Amino acid sequence: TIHEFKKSAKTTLIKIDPALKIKTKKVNTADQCANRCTRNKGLPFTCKAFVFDKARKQCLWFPFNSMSSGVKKEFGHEFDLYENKDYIRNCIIGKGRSYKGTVSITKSGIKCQPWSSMIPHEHSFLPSSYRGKDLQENYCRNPRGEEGGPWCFTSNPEVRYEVCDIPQCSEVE
Amino acid sequence: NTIHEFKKSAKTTLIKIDPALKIKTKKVNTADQCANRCTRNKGLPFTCKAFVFDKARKQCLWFPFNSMSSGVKKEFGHEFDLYENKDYIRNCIIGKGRSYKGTVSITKSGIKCQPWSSMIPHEHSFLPSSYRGKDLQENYCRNPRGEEGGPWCFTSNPEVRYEVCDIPQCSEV
Secondary structure, X not given: OHHHEEEEEEEEEEEOOOOOOOEEEEOOOXXXXXXXXXXXXXXXXXXXXXXXXXXXXXXXXXXXXXXXXXXXXXXXXXXXXXXXXXXXXXXXXXXOOOOOOOOOEEOOOOEEOOOOOOOOOOOOOOOOOOOOOOOOOOOOEOOOOOOOOOEEEEOOOOOOEEEEOOOEOOOOO | OOHHHEEEEEEEEEEEOOOOOOOEEXXXXXXXXXXXXXXXXXXXXXXXXXXXXXXXXXXEEEEOOOOOOOOEEEEEEEEEEEEEEHHHOOOOEOOOOOOOOOOOOEOOOOOEEOOOXXXXXXXXXXXXXXXXXXXXXXXXXXXXXXXXXXOEEEEOOOOOOEEEOOOOEOOOO
């Protein structure tokens, strides 16, 4: 069940609007948080994300995620944030500068190379060098808002980089 | 086994009016094998957005498109099941979400939706047959009449006839 979630290590969320619902429970593993979140049983809201506190082995279930208004993304070595994919916009606006979904395949079907790897292709697009751009794993991203839309360095040495095939939000009715 | 991650439409395949579109096929044993290959996108000269399992011919058909793509239409067939990759079904709402086709099936307060085909717990006349085009399938949040509230559903709690679902707007600044 944990695979329908995008994971951000060392991250938790804090509500700034105190009327937003939360629910917590001491649990054993992060997989058990995902299960309860996926089946949404016993939660007085739509679970959109959860955090696992690895220190206290506690789940925090939320009716919001990191893109929700009135919530902050904070660093914490004991936390892992898990965002339900159904609530991370899966289409692109303009050139997709703000795309944060989990698609990792190019238009012609090649698997993307992780942004933190220099083979097949060497580059200067490190996470460190692009704060806020979410250059995590091998996700299609568009850090500089360039023409093509989200793209990635391709795991095929013959093709340096190729755009992905993430649809425009305007594509369909 | 990634098959339960797809939006399933029974008795359905897709045909391309557009001769340019690429499809890929392979004789196989079970529908899970089509799913596994779509998820992994291995050996496909394109991004797999949907697949069909043909139960009679024991074949997978993999598509770089889905039932919402232009230049494609549905075709009825008892031997066919269609599986659409949720990553390519727009998961946010435009306007009132008349055209929402995503799979969120829980209300704002966390109540599992009642199936549109069921009169239990609530009797109603939003039968799929009265609302063709509106995809009143399974128990998905829908707004078949395009009302102010956004997508909604009859509720599995006998005390709550219906409630709106909490699906984000694609773009609202």
